[PDB]
Motif scaffolding. Structure first.
Motif, PDB file in Angstrom:
ATOM      1  N   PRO A  47       0.879  -1.244   0.064  1.00  0.00           N
ATOM      2  CA  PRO A  47       0.040   0.030   0.034  1.00  0.00           C
ATOM      3  C   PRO A  47       0.880   1.130   0.062  1.00  0.00           C
ATOM      4  O   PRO A  47       0.384   2.526  -0.282  1.00  0.00           O
ATOM      5  CB  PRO A  47      -0.824  -0.049   1.496  1.00  0.00           C
ATOM      6  N   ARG A  48       1.968   1.231   0.092  1.00  0.00           N
ATOM      7  CA  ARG A  48       3.158   2.238   0.152  1.00  0.00           C
ATOM      8  C   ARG A  48       2.769   3.406   0.959  1.00  0.00           C
ATOM      9  O   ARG A  48       3.354   4.181   0.913  1.00  0.00           O
ATOM     10  CB  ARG A  48       3.069   2.876  -1.476  1.00  0.00           C
ATOM     11  N   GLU A  99       7.628  -4.082   3.333  1.00  0.00           N
ATOM     12  CA  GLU A  99       7.810  -3.331   1.946  1.00  0.00           C
ATOM     13  C   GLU A  99       7.562  -1.956   1.902  1.00  0.00           C
ATOM     14  O   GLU A  99       8.090  -1.299   1.464  1.00  0.00           O
ATOM     15  CB  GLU A  99       6.601  -4.189   0.972  1.00  0.00           C
ATOM     16  N   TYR A 100       6.511  -1.522   2.639  1.00  0.00           N
ATOM     17  CA  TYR A 100       6.461  -0.290   2.953  1.00  0.00           C
ATOM     18  C   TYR A 100       7.798   0.430   3.722  1.00  0.00           C
ATOM     19  O   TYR A 100       8.174   1.392   3.252  1.00  0.00           O
ATOM     20  CB  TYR A 100       5.273   0.112   4.090  1.00  0.00           C
ATOM     21  N   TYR A 101       8.463  -0.383   4.842  1.00  0.00           N
ATOM     22  CA  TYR A 101       9.329   0.072   5.181  1.00  0.00           C
ATOM     23  C   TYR A 101      10.681   0.127   4.312  1.00  0.00           C
ATOM     24  O   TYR A 101      11.671   0.676   4.429  1.00  0.00           O
ATOM     25  CB  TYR A 101      10.150  -0.925   6.366  1.00  0.00           C
ATOM     26  N   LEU A 120       3.003  -6.349   4.421  1.00  0.00           N
ATOM     27  CA  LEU A 120       2.903  -5.080   3.793  1.00  0.00           C
ATOM     28  C   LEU A 120       3.537  -3.839   4.674  1.00  0.00           C
ATOM     29  O   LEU A 120       3.707  -2.723   3.878  1.00  0.00           O
ATOM     30  CB  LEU A 120       1.103  -4.712   4.096  1.00  0.00           C
ATOM     31  N   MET A 121       4.136  -3.964   5.837  1.00  0.00           N
ATOM     32  CA  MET A 121       4.858  -3.241   6.401  1.00  0.00           C
ATOM     33  C   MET A 121       6.241  -3.292   5.944  1.00  0.00           C
ATOM     34  O   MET A 121       6.900  -2.395   5.382  1.00  0.00           O
ATOM     35  CB  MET A 121       4.923  -3.586   8.113  1.00  0.00           C
ATOM     36  N   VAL A 181      -1.826   0.770   4.909  1.00  0.00           N
ATOM     37  CA  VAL A 181      -1.153  -0.433   5.625  1.00  0.00           C
ATOM     38  C   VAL A 181      -1.852  -0.932   6.758  1.00  0.00           C
ATOM     39  O   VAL A 181      -2.445  -1.947   6.974  1.00  0.00           O
ATOM     40  CB  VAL A 181       0.140  -0.422   6.065  1.00  0.00           C
ATOM     41  N   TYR A 234      10.267   0.931   1.025  1.00  0.00           N
ATOM     42  CA  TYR A 234       9.970   2.178   0.188  1.00  0.00           C
ATOM     43  C   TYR A 234      10.368   3.644   1.015  1.00  0.00           C
ATOM     44  O   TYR A 234      10.898   4.380   0.591  1.00  0.00           O
ATOM     45  CB  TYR A 234       8.743   2.170  -0.499  1.00  0.00           C
ATOM     46  N   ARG A 235       9.858   3.589   2.342  1.00  0.00           N
ATOM     47  CA  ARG A 235       9.522   4.551   2.955  1.00  0.00           C
ATOM     48  C   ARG A 235      11.129   4.893   3.616  1.00  0.00           C
ATOM     49  O   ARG A 235      11.439   6.180   3.925  1.00  0.00           O
ATOM     50  CB  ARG A 235       8.705   4.622   4.379  1.00  0.00           C
ATOM     51  N   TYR A 236      12.106   3.819   3.964  1.00  0.00           N
ATOM     52  CA  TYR A 236      13.327   4.015   4.301  1.00  0.00           C
ATOM     53  C   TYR A 236      14.113   3.101   3.346  1.00  0.00           C
ATOM     54  O   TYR A 236      13.120   2.361   2.557  1.00  0.00           O
ATOM     55  CB  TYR A 236      13.786   3.750   5.757  1.00  0.00           C
TER      56      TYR A 236
END
Ligand SMILES: NC(=O)c1ccc[n+]([C@@H]2O[C@H](COP(=O)([O-])OP(=O)(O)OC[C@H]3O[C@@H](n4cnc5c(N)ncnc54)[C@H](O)[C@@H]3O)[C@@H](O)[C@H]2O)c1
Ligand SMILES: NC(=O)c1ccc[n+]([C@@H]2O[C@H](COP(=O)([O-])OP(=O)(O)OC[C@H]3O[C@@H](n4cnc5c(N)ncnc54)[C@H](O)[C@@H]3O)[C@@H](O)[C@H]2O)c1
Lengths: 206, 215
Positions: free
Chosen positions: A118-119, B134-136, B131-132, A124, B138-140
Motif C-alpha cells: 500500500p506504500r 515492503e512499506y519500510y 505490507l509493513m 497499511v 520504500y519509506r526508508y
C-alpha cells in the motif's frame, strides 16, 4: 436507546456524525471525544470528553463509567500527516485499533471503524483494520462493522454519515460480511441493508 | 562477511539455519537468540544471547554491540498456541515485528522475516509482516527480504534443507537481482519469481524426501 462514544470526534466527519446521532438518540447519549481542544459550539453540543486512544485504561474507564454500547472510531493519523511522523501514525492507527478492539470485545460494544477503497502507513493500517476486525468477530463475539469510505466532500458527506448510521442500526443477522464497499458516483451494501446514495453528480452541485 | 543475529532461534528452523550459517561465515559470526533456556549443545555451538523481541531497547543494544549486519526474525507465536493467547500472540507477532523493522532500518541491517501461505491472528500478522516490510523498503532503505514458507517437513510441502538454503540464498543475492521483496518459494505438492530472479531450485523433490526421512 444506545449510548455512543465517538473517537476522533473533532474531525471532518465526527462532528457531523455526532449531531446526527444526537438528534436521534438524544443529547446526553452521544459522548464526543478527542485529544485536541473542542471549539466553543461543539463542546456545548453534548458531553465531550478527552480520550487518548493509545491510553488503553482511559477507554475502559470511559466505556464502563459512561455505559457505552456503540463506539465509532474516527481517530487516525491522516496519510501525509503520518508519513512525516511514521512511528506516531503506526501507533495511533494500529495500537489504537488494538486498544479499541479490546475495550469493545471485553465490554460487549458495537464497534464501527471506517476503512477505505500500500506504500503508506495509513493504508497499511486500513488493510490491518479490516483483517483484525474480521478476526475479532470470529474469535470473540465482537459486533464489528466497517465500510470502506471513498473520497468524501468520490461521495458526499451526508451519504457518508447516514451510511454509517444505518449499518449500525441494522441487525447482525442481515450482515453477510463485516466490511462493506460503499459507493456513490457495492451490491452487498445495497442488498443486505437498504443502501442508496442520495447525492450523485447533478444534485451534488445543489 | 556478515554478522548474523537469529531471533527466536530455539525453534525448528532457528537451530538449523544457525548451524548452516556458522559453517558458511564462521562460528562466532552467528549469534543465536531466544527467550528460552537453550539446550546444552546449542548454547556451545556458538554465541547465544537472551533476546526478548518485546523489548525494543534490548534489540538495539544487541545490534550495536555485535555490529549485526544480517538479522533473521524467527520469533513468533504460531497460531496453535496464539489462538488461545491472542493478546500475547498479537504483541509478539505485530509489536515484536515493529521493533525488528525499526532496529533494522535504524542500524541499517538486512532483515529476513518468513511468511506463510485470514482467520487466525498469526495469519493476520503475516499479512502485516508483508505490507509493513515492503512499506519500510520504500519509506526508508530497509533491505527487507521475505520468503513465504510452505509446509516444512523435518525429522505444498518442503524439506527443511530447502527452507534453510533458500533463506541463505535470498539474503546473499544482489539487491540488484530482486524485482520484489516478498517471494513465493515452492518445492512439491501431493514460485516463478523466486526461480526467475535469484535462481531458486529445490533439491528435495519427493523421491529423495522419503529416502532421507527413513534414516
Ligand atoms: N476525510 C476523508 O475524506 C476521508 C477519506 C477516507 C477515509 N476517511 C476515514 O474517516 C475517518 C474519520 O475522518 P475525519 O475527517 O473525521 O478524521 P480527521 O483526519 O479530520 O481527524 C482525525 C482525528 O483523530 C484524532 N486523533 C489523533 N490521534 C489520536 C489519539 N491518539 N487518540 C484520540 N484521537 C486522536 C485527531 O485529534 C483528529 O480529531 C478516518 O479514520 C479516515 O480513515 C476519511
Ligand atoms: N516451520 C513451519 O511450519 C513454518 C511454516 C510457515 C512459516 N513459518 C515461519 O517460520 C518462523 C519460525 O518457525 P519455527 O518452526 O522456528 O517456529 P517455533 O514455534 O519452533 O519457534 C518460534 C520461536 O519464537 C520464540 N519467541 C517467542 N516469543 C518471543 C519473544 N518475545 N522474543 C523472542 N523470541 C520469542 C520462541 O521461544 C520460539 O523458539 C515463524 O516466524 C513462522 O512464521 C514456519
Amino acid at each position: 436507546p444506545p449510548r455512543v462514544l465517538i473517537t476522533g470526534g473533532l474531525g471532518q466527519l465526527g462532528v457531523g456524525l455526532a449531531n446526527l446521532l444526537r438528534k436521534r438518540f438524544g443529547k446526553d447519549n452521544v459522548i464526543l471525544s478527542d485529544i485536541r481542544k473542542p471549539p466553543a459550539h461543539v463542546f456545548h453540543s453534548g458531553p465531550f470528553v478527552y480520550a487518548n486512544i493509545l491510553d488503553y485504561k482511559s477507554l475502559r474507564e470511559i466505556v464502563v463509567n459512561h455505559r457505552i454500547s456503540w463506539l465509532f472510531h474516527y481517530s487516525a493519523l491522516l496519510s501525509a500527516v503520518g508519513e512525516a511522523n511514521v512511528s506516531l501514525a503506526r501507533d495511533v492507527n494500529i495500537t489504537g485499533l488494538h486498544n479499541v478492539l479490546d475495550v469493545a470485545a471485553e465490554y460487549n460494544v458495537r464497534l464501527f471503524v471506517p476503512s477505505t477503497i500500500p506504500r503508506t502507513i495509513y493504508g497499511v493500517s486500513k488493510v490491518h483494520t479490516e483483517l483484525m476486525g474480521e478476526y475479532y468477530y470470529y474469535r470473540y463475539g465482537l459486533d464489528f462493522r466497517c465500510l470502506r469510505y471513498p473520497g468524501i466532500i468520490m461521495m458526499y458527506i451526508s451519504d457518508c454519515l447516514r451510511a454509517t448510521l444505518e449499518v449500525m442500526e441494522a441487525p447482525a443477522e442481515r450482515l453477510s460480511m463485516r466490511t462493506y464497499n460503499i459507493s456513490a458516483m457495492d451490491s452487498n451494501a445495497r442488498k443486505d441493508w437498504g443502501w442508496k446514495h442520495d447525492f450523485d453528480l447533478p444534485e451534488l452541485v445543489a
